[PDB]
Amino acid sequence: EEYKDVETAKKEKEQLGELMEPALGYVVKVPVSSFENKKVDISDIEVITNGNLDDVPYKANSSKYNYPDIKTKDSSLQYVRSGYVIDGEHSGSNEKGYVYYKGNSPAKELPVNQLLTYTGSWDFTSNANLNNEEGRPNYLNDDYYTKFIGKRVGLVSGDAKPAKHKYTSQFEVDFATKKMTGKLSDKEKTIYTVNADIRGNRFTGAATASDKNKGKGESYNFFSADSQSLEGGFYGPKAEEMAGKFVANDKSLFAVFSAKHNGSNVDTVRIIDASKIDLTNFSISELNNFGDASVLIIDGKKIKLAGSGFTNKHTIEINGKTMVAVACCSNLEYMKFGQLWQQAEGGKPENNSLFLQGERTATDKMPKGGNYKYIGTWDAQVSKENNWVATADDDRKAGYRTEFDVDFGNKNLSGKLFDKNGVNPVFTVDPKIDGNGFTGKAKTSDAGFALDSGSSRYENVKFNDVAVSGGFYGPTAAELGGQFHHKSENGSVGAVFGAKQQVKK
């Protein structure tokens, strides 16, 4: 043969609960009830797809408010924002406003082992409950800028007078154990404790109400319900900041929070690769990714990369553009790579690009030794006077093959990338393995290769010292992938590759 894919457990399929999907952010409307429908709960939570911290959800709506009150932007926060957009002199049937969090740059590296405290604030809206039985307070003029608290209109943190209420948050993250603990406080009183586990760049868990008694009248407690729906993310390339939300299990409260750690020169490890090489410019950009390499986010919209084929085409409309992705491969579970272009129907493919996403192997799971072969394929474009392409395929004898020898003992990797029917590879790779990744150089042979395999028309393209970088993906590092690109007068290339560990016989 003489090699075959190593048999590996398939990735355990997961379905996250309805409140537990990762997103850049979320926003909810403050509930409003009435004599006819006296209880109105948190509902209609909406995803945010805009990571720009200067744009607050529903800002335009707020121009019509009696007293627009948009919670101020904390200048020390670079990647996250949470708060509210409310009418501070709310009256009548007009809307009260919204509570939200958002972030940009979902973390692709996490701190390795430093115990880090994130400090910040939290905000909330209650539901609306006019029921006499509920016993919500009528008059608390020293506490809030409104009356009939949480009755016809949900109570918002932005209703509270700072003399009596200040909602602050603190979280302690042990990155070594992927555990988070913390407290949401009001001045010197603990209101919730929180517990979560980290997966990818997200955390999921619970908020525990510190006072389980609702009480009644002036002593009514808005924060009596627990939540099993705490979910948030680390944002900033190295998880500098965090933001998230939870919903009370009885839908009586929606809370949001954001915070930033006080660490200096923190050592980090990679968890995610997700990038795109633009094939007109041969330039690289980051993709938003939360730790699932099979979810490809394009211009805010999620594409689920699943399919029966060795590679699968996805044609999706996003903001009035028709995007096409061809993703590889059916035999890789912890990474995806392929081609992405725009093609109206219509019928001409434009703005072609490549992408690679991977879920890095935990560094404690990297083999400490052994020698292995990896085999896979690649997608690429090479350009000079002419164009040349590699298109991912599964013909392991004659196709667009890739092969790698990996020596975990000596931390060494080398590779070969082939043209279809090619005797010798068009590119070789030589690098070093550091933890769950590798970096090195790509080059052609001394004579290089011809871009049109039919004409003797132009000089062969040649490349030397082209940066290559990539990683090991999945629980046992049985998958690897990476990318390289280069642009000059002497030729251009963009290339993404992936390969599966082999076993003999």
XYZ file of C-alpha atoms in Angstrom:
505
model
C 0.000 0.000 0.000
C 2.020 0.480 2.081
C 0.377 2.825 4.655
C -3.182 3.353 5.932
C -4.891 5.933 8.187
C -4.489 5.029 11.829
C -7.828 3.989 13.374
C -8.885 6.640 15.801
C -12.043 7.125 17.879
C -14.435 9.521 16.140
C -14.967 12.965 17.734
C -17.900 12.617 20.127
C -20.689 14.609 18.521
C -22.037 17.267 20.839
C -25.257 19.290 20.951
C -25.037 22.361 23.189
C -28.252 23.509 24.877
C -30.263 26.332 23.242
C -28.726 28.954 25.613
C -25.254 27.512 25.349
C -24.141 28.296 21.759
C -21.018 30.503 21.480
C -21.343 33.889 19.751
C -19.478 37.218 19.609
C -22.241 38.522 21.861
C -25.908 38.525 22.865
C -28.578 41.158 23.538
C -32.047 41.067 25.084
C -34.996 43.462 25.337
C -36.074 44.524 28.824
C -39.509 42.787 29.337
C -42.682 44.848 29.705
C -45.913 43.344 31.083
C -49.520 44.657 31.261
C -52.810 44.199 33.151
C -53.828 41.557 30.578
C -50.441 39.651 30.627
C -49.075 40.390 34.048
C -45.966 38.144 33.911
C -43.589 38.559 30.958
C -40.299 36.631 31.133
C -36.868 36.997 29.553
C -37.347 35.897 25.940
C -36.102 36.535 22.406
C -32.399 36.686 23.225
C -30.608 37.771 20.025
C -27.156 36.955 18.738
C -24.701 39.772 18.087
C -22.481 39.420 14.939
C -20.768 42.861 15.168
C -17.628 42.797 17.431
C -17.044 46.581 17.229
C -17.048 47.888 20.795
C -18.065 51.383 19.735
C -21.355 50.163 18.344
C -23.885 49.523 21.108
C -26.881 47.325 20.155
C -29.995 49.411 19.237
C -28.149 52.717 19.505
C -30.415 54.230 16.777
C -33.566 53.248 18.725
C -32.227 55.105 21.754
C -32.374 58.521 20.036
C -36.165 58.434 20.636
C -35.884 57.730 24.390
C -36.943 60.362 26.918
C -33.510 60.230 28.552
C -31.156 57.977 26.559
C -28.869 56.210 28.998
C -26.174 54.083 27.355
C -23.770 52.671 29.904
C -20.387 54.300 29.421
C -17.491 52.535 27.649
C -14.685 51.418 29.976
C -11.496 52.725 28.275
C -9.301 49.919 29.719
C -11.304 47.180 27.901
C -9.881 46.458 24.439
C -11.817 43.367 23.348
C -15.101 43.175 25.306
C -18.056 45.393 26.373
C -21.164 44.733 28.408
C -23.873 47.123 29.666
C -27.275 48.487 28.820
C -29.026 50.922 26.464
C -32.118 52.197 28.319
C -34.557 55.074 28.749
C -33.698 56.516 32.158
C -37.020 58.409 32.242
C -39.127 55.607 30.861
C -42.889 56.304 30.516
C -45.808 54.800 28.650
C -45.759 51.966 26.149
C -42.481 52.954 24.442
C -39.632 50.438 24.913
C -37.434 50.466 28.035
C -34.201 49.255 26.287
C -31.695 46.417 26.157
C -28.956 44.575 28.097
C -26.003 43.030 26.193
C -22.430 41.808 26.052
C -20.112 41.522 23.111
C -16.464 40.924 22.212
C -14.091 40.656 19.287
C -10.969 38.550 18.657
C -12.096 35.280 20.389
C -8.877 33.935 22.041
C -6.668 31.564 20.016
C -4.126 31.183 22.811
C -4.734 30.719 26.538
C -2.416 31.229 29.569
C -0.572 27.963 30.288
C -0.787 27.759 34.038
C -0.913 31.204 35.748
C -3.909 31.605 38.142
C -5.524 34.777 36.803
C -8.151 37.117 38.317
C -10.422 38.979 35.880
C -12.089 42.041 37.389
C -14.959 44.069 35.953
C -18.712 44.696 36.233
C -22.010 42.993 35.653
C -25.457 44.267 34.594
C -28.930 42.717 34.371
C -32.562 43.080 33.553
C -35.300 41.369 35.556
C -38.507 40.108 33.991
C -41.804 42.066 34.397
C -44.302 40.786 37.002
C -47.389 42.782 37.867
C -48.980 39.981 39.895
C -50.005 41.162 43.378
C -48.960 37.773 44.722
C -45.333 38.267 43.583
C -44.879 41.117 46.067
C -42.443 43.272 44.086
C -41.630 46.621 45.716
C -43.637 49.747 44.993
C -41.475 52.511 46.485
C -37.654 52.516 46.928
C -36.665 56.071 46.080
C -33.203 55.815 47.717
C -32.401 52.664 45.653
C -33.786 53.314 42.128
C -34.739 56.135 39.738
C -38.192 54.574 39.160
C -41.278 53.236 41.064
C -43.190 49.913 40.841
C -39.881 48.056 40.607
C -39.890 45.186 38.097
C -43.697 45.347 37.900
C -44.920 46.663 34.594
C -41.316 47.122 33.387
C -38.263 44.940 34.062
C -35.802 46.374 36.574
C -32.413 47.184 34.941
C -29.034 47.601 36.744
C -28.996 51.055 35.058
C -32.037 52.028 37.128
C -30.043 51.746 40.375
C -28.650 54.785 42.268
C -24.844 54.472 42.645
C -25.104 55.629 46.290
C -26.742 52.292 47.146
C -25.803 49.881 44.295
C -22.614 49.116 42.412
C -22.525 45.864 40.478
C -18.990 44.514 40.273
C -17.592 41.200 39.114
C -14.508 39.142 39.875
C -13.477 35.777 38.393
C -10.523 33.502 39.142
C -9.416 31.294 36.266
C -7.124 28.302 36.747
C -6.012 27.632 33.186
C -4.149 24.488 34.307
C -7.419 22.860 35.346
C -9.754 24.731 32.895
C -11.855 25.859 35.887
C -13.366 29.241 36.719
C -14.864 30.462 39.988
C -16.086 33.978 40.812
C -18.573 36.345 42.430
C -21.035 38.974 41.244
C -21.384 41.542 44.026
C -23.410 44.651 44.871
C -21.108 46.901 46.888
C -20.041 44.640 49.810
C -22.703 42.002 49.318
C -22.281 38.794 47.293
C -25.221 38.245 44.949
C -24.124 35.190 42.935
C -21.226 32.845 42.896
C -20.240 31.337 39.583
C -18.554 28.089 38.409
C -17.629 27.157 34.893
C -15.474 24.906 32.750
C -13.434 26.066 29.771
C -13.799 24.424 26.323
C -12.097 26.039 23.298
C -12.160 29.756 24.097
C -15.552 29.522 25.842
C -16.732 28.697 29.339
C -20.010 27.034 30.421
C -21.440 26.563 33.867
C -23.762 27.882 36.549
C -24.566 30.928 38.681
C -25.644 30.167 42.263
C -27.918 32.718 43.926
C -26.329 33.732 47.250
C -29.722 34.589 48.848
C -32.352 31.950 47.930
C -35.213 33.836 49.646
C -37.411 35.987 47.404
C -38.967 37.867 50.343
C -41.736 40.384 49.684
C -42.426 44.144 49.454
C -39.463 46.413 50.314
C -37.216 43.445 51.036
C -38.050 41.624 47.729
C -34.948 39.920 46.351
C -34.652 40.020 42.523
C -31.712 37.509 42.500
C -33.164 34.401 44.152
C -33.035 31.993 41.196
C -30.057 29.890 40.149
C -28.908 29.565 36.513
C -27.555 26.523 34.684
C -27.050 28.676 31.587
C -23.879 30.641 32.252
C -21.885 30.893 29.005
C -19.212 33.269 27.850
C -15.876 33.600 26.101
C -12.311 34.761 26.344
C -11.507 37.542 23.945
C -8.209 39.140 22.933
C -5.674 36.962 21.116
C -4.364 35.630 24.457
C -7.603 35.730 26.561
C -6.750 39.179 27.978
C -10.482 39.757 28.700
C -13.726 37.801 29.173
C -17.457 38.472 28.797
C -20.642 36.440 29.089
C -24.172 36.025 30.336
C -26.583 33.841 32.151
C -30.345 33.391 32.376
C -32.211 32.496 35.607
C -33.716 28.980 35.375
C -37.232 30.507 35.860
C -36.510 33.240 33.224
C -36.786 36.038 35.865
C -33.296 37.527 35.244
C -30.769 38.022 32.432
C -27.298 38.940 33.606
C -24.210 40.005 31.605
C -20.599 40.640 32.643
C -17.197 41.661 31.334
C -13.780 41.777 33.010
C -10.029 41.930 32.310
C -7.140 40.152 34.026
C -4.216 41.961 35.663
C -1.423 39.599 34.482
C 1.931 40.707 32.970
C 3.983 38.843 30.343
C 1.746 35.760 30.624
C 3.097 32.540 29.001
C 0.488 31.125 26.611
C -0.256 27.984 24.582
C -2.206 27.813 21.286
C -5.702 26.279 21.318
C -6.985 27.270 17.892
C -5.939 27.995 14.329
C -8.438 29.742 12.038
C -7.146 31.914 9.218
C -7.770 32.803 5.631
C -5.262 33.484 2.840
C -6.581 35.884 0.190
C -5.418 34.562 -3.230
C -5.498 37.892 -5.097
C -3.271 39.636 -2.520
C -1.521 36.576 -0.969
C -2.242 38.117 2.446
C -3.448 36.337 5.650
C -6.290 37.301 8.040
C -7.784 35.788 11.222
C -11.175 34.075 11.232
C -13.464 34.169 14.249
C -13.569 30.684 15.771
C -14.706 29.337 19.143
C -12.928 25.967 19.132
C -14.934 23.978 16.561
C -12.841 23.658 13.356
C -16.025 22.369 11.638
C -17.754 25.721 12.031
C -16.531 28.307 9.559
C -17.724 31.849 10.235
C -17.912 34.050 7.126
C -18.845 37.719 7.410
C -20.642 36.913 10.674
C -22.559 33.827 9.446
C -21.845 30.263 10.655
C -21.232 27.551 8.032
C -21.350 23.969 9.373
C -18.701 21.953 7.558
C -20.245 18.484 7.378
C -20.751 16.277 4.350
C -20.556 12.842 2.880
C -17.847 13.534 0.342
C -14.095 13.512 0.712
C -14.562 17.236 0.150
C -17.904 19.075 0.256
C -19.104 22.278 -1.387
C -21.244 24.750 0.592
C -23.096 27.558 -1.130
C -24.442 30.112 1.316
C -25.964 33.616 0.983
C -24.430 36.124 3.368
C -25.407 39.806 3.272
C -26.440 39.535 -0.421
C -23.246 37.784 -1.585
C -23.187 34.138 -2.578
C -20.272 32.450 -0.823
C -18.888 29.040 -1.768
C -16.667 26.907 0.463
C -15.113 23.575 -0.474
C -13.916 21.900 2.677
C -11.602 18.933 3.253
C -11.538 16.229 4.512
C -13.929 13.331 5.398
C -11.065 11.555 7.239
C -10.074 14.517 9.470
C -12.180 15.228 12.571
C -10.259 18.022 14.385
C -9.323 20.320 11.455
C -10.779 21.513 8.122
C -9.138 23.317 5.206
C -10.112 24.299 1.726
C -11.136 26.956 -0.701
C -13.464 29.904 -0.371
C -14.672 32.213 -3.109
C -17.598 34.406 -4.132
C -19.703 33.200 -7.026
C -23.061 34.644 -7.990
C -25.376 32.571 -10.183
C -24.108 34.191 -12.359
C -21.344 31.629 -12.610
C -17.902 33.264 -12.340
C -15.872 32.529 -9.163
C -14.307 35.726 -7.765
C -12.185 36.736 -4.722
C -10.813 33.253 -4.262
C -9.112 32.439 -0.922
C -7.933 29.492 1.222
C -8.793 28.678 4.858
C -7.473 26.414 7.598
C -9.023 25.717 10.993
C -7.796 23.317 13.673
C -8.398 22.389 17.331
C -4.860 22.067 18.784
C -3.807 18.981 20.708
C -3.523 19.657 24.462
C 0.247 19.941 25.066
C 0.081 17.355 27.870
C -1.258 14.875 25.263
C 1.520 15.416 22.674
C 3.511 12.200 22.196
C 6.850 12.415 24.020
C 8.528 10.221 21.364
C 8.111 7.935 18.348
C 8.410 8.308 14.558
C 5.379 8.586 12.299
C 4.223 9.087 8.722
C 1.383 11.466 7.969
C -0.470 11.484 4.652
C -3.064 13.930 3.299
C -3.655 16.514 0.615
C -3.605 20.292 0.042
C -5.192 23.313 -1.682
C -2.928 25.961 -3.165
C -2.344 28.540 -5.815
C 1.042 29.395 -7.262
C 1.389 32.404 -9.607
C 3.924 34.091 -11.850
C 3.288 34.807 -15.552
C 0.867 31.864 -15.318
C -1.389 30.312 -12.626
C -1.180 26.785 -11.091
C -3.455 25.133 -8.489
C -3.582 22.219 -6.102
C -7.110 20.972 -5.441
C -7.680 18.618 -2.461
C -8.320 15.020 -3.564
C -8.107 11.441 -2.246
C -6.003 9.754 -4.957
C -3.100 8.785 -2.719
C -1.066 7.380 -5.627
C -1.315 10.111 -8.257
C -3.189 13.070 -6.753
C -2.317 16.241 -4.846
C -0.546 14.264 -2.151
C 1.134 15.469 1.000
C 3.451 13.361 3.160
C 5.274 14.131 6.383
C 7.821 12.346 8.552
C 7.372 13.320 12.155
C 9.935 12.600 14.818
C 8.415 13.534 18.210
C 11.568 12.368 20.065
C 13.858 14.865 18.361
C 11.088 17.453 17.760
C 11.479 17.251 13.964
C 9.118 17.348 11.046
C 9.660 17.311 7.309
C 7.236 17.152 4.432
C 6.510 16.870 0.753
C 3.706 18.406 -1.258
C 2.935 17.017 -4.722
C 1.379 18.085 -7.988
C -1.028 15.565 -9.549
C 1.012 12.892 -11.512
C 4.149 14.515 -10.071
C 7.272 12.396 -9.657
C 9.025 14.752 -7.269
C 7.246 17.116 -4.894
C 6.866 20.726 -5.885
C 7.458 21.892 -2.284
C 9.339 20.469 0.655
C 9.031 21.570 4.279
C 11.553 21.465 7.151
C 10.735 22.675 10.690
C 10.829 22.140 14.453
C 8.036 21.007 16.750
C 7.426 23.118 19.850
C 4.625 21.850 22.158
C 1.484 21.326 19.977
C 2.722 23.191 16.917
C 5.545 23.440 14.395
C 7.211 26.176 12.323
C 9.869 26.153 9.692
C 10.417 26.830 6.015
C 9.034 25.809 2.642
C 11.066 25.723 -0.597
C 11.125 24.296 -4.095
C 13.900 22.144 -5.514
C 16.939 23.997 -6.902
C 15.434 23.986 -10.447
C 11.895 24.847 -9.206
C 8.854 23.812 -11.246
C 6.962 24.859 -14.369
C 3.595 26.564 -13.852
C 2.142 25.344 -17.147
C 2.911 21.605 -17.440
C 2.315 21.834 -21.231
C 4.372 24.901 -22.324
C 8.159 25.451 -21.958
C 7.240 29.110 -22.203
C 8.461 30.625 -18.852
C 11.229 30.112 -16.276
C 10.287 27.665 -13.503
C 9.039 29.245 -10.288
C 11.459 28.960 -7.347
C 10.909 29.540 -3.628
C 13.299 29.571 -0.674
C 12.920 30.347 3.062
C 9.073 30.736 2.912
C 7.672 30.711 6.444
C 5.528 27.685 7.213
C 3.647 27.202 10.431
C 1.008 24.770 11.701
C -0.098 22.444 14.416
C -1.119 19.082 15.736
C -4.872 18.616 16.201
C -7.060 16.308 18.280
C -6.530 14.260 21.446
C -3.591 12.186 20.248
C -2.025 14.516 17.624
C -3.139 12.065 14.911
C -3.894 15.001 12.595
C -1.602 17.822 11.471
C -2.033 20.862 9.247
C -0.498 24.210 8.368
C -0.044 26.973 5.859
C 2.439 29.116 4.074
C 2.246 32.102 1.781
C 4.624 34.418 -0.014
C 4.508 37.204 -2.577
C 7.237 38.874 -4.642
C 8.275 39.637 -8.225
C 9.783 36.082 -8.441
C 6.399 34.437 -7.835
C 3.544 34.087 -5.324
C 2.056 31.187 -3.347
C -0.765 30.468 -0.902
C -1.114 26.928 0.397
C -3.073 25.081 3.102
C -2.515 21.432 3.985
C -3.689 18.631 6.276
C -2.572 15.021 6.950
C -3.607 11.989 9.011
C -1.167 9.792 11.014
C -0.575 6.432 9.302
C -0.076 2.866 10.470
C 1.756 0.166 8.439
C 0.408 -3.179 7.053
